[PDB]
Amino acid sequence: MVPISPIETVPVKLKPGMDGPKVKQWPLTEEKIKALVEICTEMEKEGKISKIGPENPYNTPVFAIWRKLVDFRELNKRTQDFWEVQLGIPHPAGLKKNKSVTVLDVGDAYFSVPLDEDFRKYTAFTIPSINNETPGIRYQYNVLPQGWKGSPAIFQSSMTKILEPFAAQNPDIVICQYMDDLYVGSDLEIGQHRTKIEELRQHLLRWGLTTPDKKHQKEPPFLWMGYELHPDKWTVQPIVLPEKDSWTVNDIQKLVGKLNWASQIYPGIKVRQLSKLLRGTKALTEVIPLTEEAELELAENREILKEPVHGVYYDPSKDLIAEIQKQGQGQWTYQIYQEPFKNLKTGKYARMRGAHTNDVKQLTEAVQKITTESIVIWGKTPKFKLPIQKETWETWWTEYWQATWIPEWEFVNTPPLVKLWYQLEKEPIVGAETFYVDGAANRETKLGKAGYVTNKGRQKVVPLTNTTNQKTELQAIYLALQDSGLEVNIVTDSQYALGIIQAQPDKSESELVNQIIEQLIKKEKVYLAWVPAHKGIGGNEQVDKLV
């Protein structure tokens, strides 16, 4: 016999202060008992398990579905935490094309990885005896049991340590571990490729691990995690949007799942209007009617998803480019590619929940998201194509109160272009009328007043119902904007309104703020000055609006 190299065992412990499992075995039928006796005798003959005496106080229930199925949920609850087998799902667009990709079944190695001997006693289980007239057969696992908490991590780490030298001394191949399958890709000639595959089978056999010589079941196209992986391209598995006379909550959730999933290769997917229907529902069986916006969005989606689209694999010798387009209503879409008309992938970004916003902030956030995703998938930041002029961005970031930065990018002229809609003056405007504004409200009756007095003698006070102090302050500014010329100075004491306007929104939840934004867009020059209230600053009239 050729000596087999031993696989180093991983030391395993239980969670601190806890003890091994002690679960009562379920009573089984006579035929199930016989089945488990045959299976367990076979496994004992192979060495996966061993018989134990009565001294072991631990026990884990066993079932038969024959097939033996041990329920390790209790031992899993009591087992220590392990390092994750994966920190994320690989994305197909990150893969690098290979002339040959071979698949090897290392499932038989799963049962050849030994278990820490001091931990084996916690895996004990009992086969019930016929009619329960003799003591049940006591077994314990000698290898990593299927279903135990630490089996995938310990198996992956053991296989990684085994494969490390073979991969180190064959840098012209790529070896990847996924579950009980190994994937070996190379750009070598098919003969040299199959040769190095045989070398891998031998190197694995030096640890006693057997790879089947049978023609494998996996073959192009690879179906994996909702993906199709082809020799030269990748795509999502076919996305079919169902025809429904009425849509329930699960119908629309399935639809938004299919659209989100399809958005990574199909450009232009929109989920805003369909997602708007699921707001605060929390009822899986509820049936919600479709708005017209949801119907138009769904029609555009059916038009985008009518024929298949594929993405290419990554070529590290070419540049990485990401182009962004604005879609409206806080929606953004983007394409990542290295060659024109051949996308690596696509995606979308929706604006965050907020009371006020503008397009530049949203484009910035989308840039950060694409940057992070691209560093994840490809390990580098892409060069950006953005629908915003260089001078627009320079004005924005030079005048914005926050620090902001976008990586290397170039302007692409693809409407709608992101622009600044208004810019407040830095100094008071000579020759422009000066509007002193104020507003106030009663906390109980919700009655308020908003108005202004100007240096030319112009005055206005408007009474308001169902209002607050903040609303009357904004309304006062709005009245000043309505009744002034193209250039106007405005004096307020509202720290709230200044906090809003200094954030430079172009859209808001409050219709009053939106009206102020429209008025600002119509103006030529606006200077907004702030003063402390109740300090006797003449013009600033708190008494006029408190009557």
Added chain:
Amino acid sequence: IETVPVKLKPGMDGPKVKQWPLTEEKIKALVEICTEMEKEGKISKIGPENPYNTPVFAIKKKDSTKWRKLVDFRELNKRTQDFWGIPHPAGLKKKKSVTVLDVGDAYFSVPLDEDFRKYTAFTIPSINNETPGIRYQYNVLPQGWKGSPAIFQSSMTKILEPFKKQNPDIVIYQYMDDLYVGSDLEIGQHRTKIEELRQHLLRWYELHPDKWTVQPIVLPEKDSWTVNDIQKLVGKLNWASQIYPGIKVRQLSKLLRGTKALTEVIPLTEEAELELAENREILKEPVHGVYYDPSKDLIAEIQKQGQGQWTYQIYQEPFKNLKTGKYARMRGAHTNDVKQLTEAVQKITTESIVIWGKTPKFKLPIQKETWETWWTEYWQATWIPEWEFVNTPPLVKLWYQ
């Protein structure tokens, strides 16, 4: 040569922090660095039985092209038991010049307590989540961990004993992997003395705190005031009245009576000039009841003033500033706001280390996603402070300009 027992605080498990994504060049740099360290026994590979993690990235220090490995030990540092202490040298900030030296390599000559090693685990990440990452743990005192200067403090005293006995006028402080050496000598004599100390440490950053002072509130001096000038002055004086008690604005607010054009010149009455002069005299005095409490956090606020100018304030209680400053230095960051902010954070943290011996909690005028996306690209310091983000523009900005 002998390990000192180290443990965590009662009831606290080890750190489990997600490793953030890294560029390919930083990953490769970390692979080279960690391979070399593994050859030297400083670190060792670990198995899946280690569930703990601390993030790692790579930087490039000043005047050097070689990559450096930076570990973010913030979580482990706050989860590590308190070591004990030495009172902070209150004379270090009073010295004319201070030089910072990176003494981290020395930490690698002292072995780490075996049972604690598993808490220093870190992961070199893989591109595209292909592997769970290359996992390591430290065998010696790691750089950036708060226990390293505490454990090495005796050896550091033994090494610095001859130099401290030779020059009683030189102040020496230690914070993390940095050694701050303050003196009053000339720049040339200071550099030759620094080479003397580095060759002294071998066989076993110009900073001038004297050119830094606290910044008082100043008011404009004008011969003609517009309505707008007077309104801004009243606003600033009203803000300062929260800090200084006797500030008075009513005589200046009297001039604003009536609805006048913002650009109209208003002459100052005599009562207004007297009020303004009294306010000037009040602002020339220090703030009343300003003290430092070592049991409280230090809070640092930063405002972007434009044109590469930044203001900052360090305080513990509102309106009780312990330090104020204005960083306008321009160093290869003319077109990048985030790089300027990162450099400002590093400088303010250094000043806080010199003054109080600990790092402040920053309030950054930046969106979380931008900062967290880009701050590691420009970080050059061994330590890392804590920060929060302000999303509402503060009105007091122009009052610090």
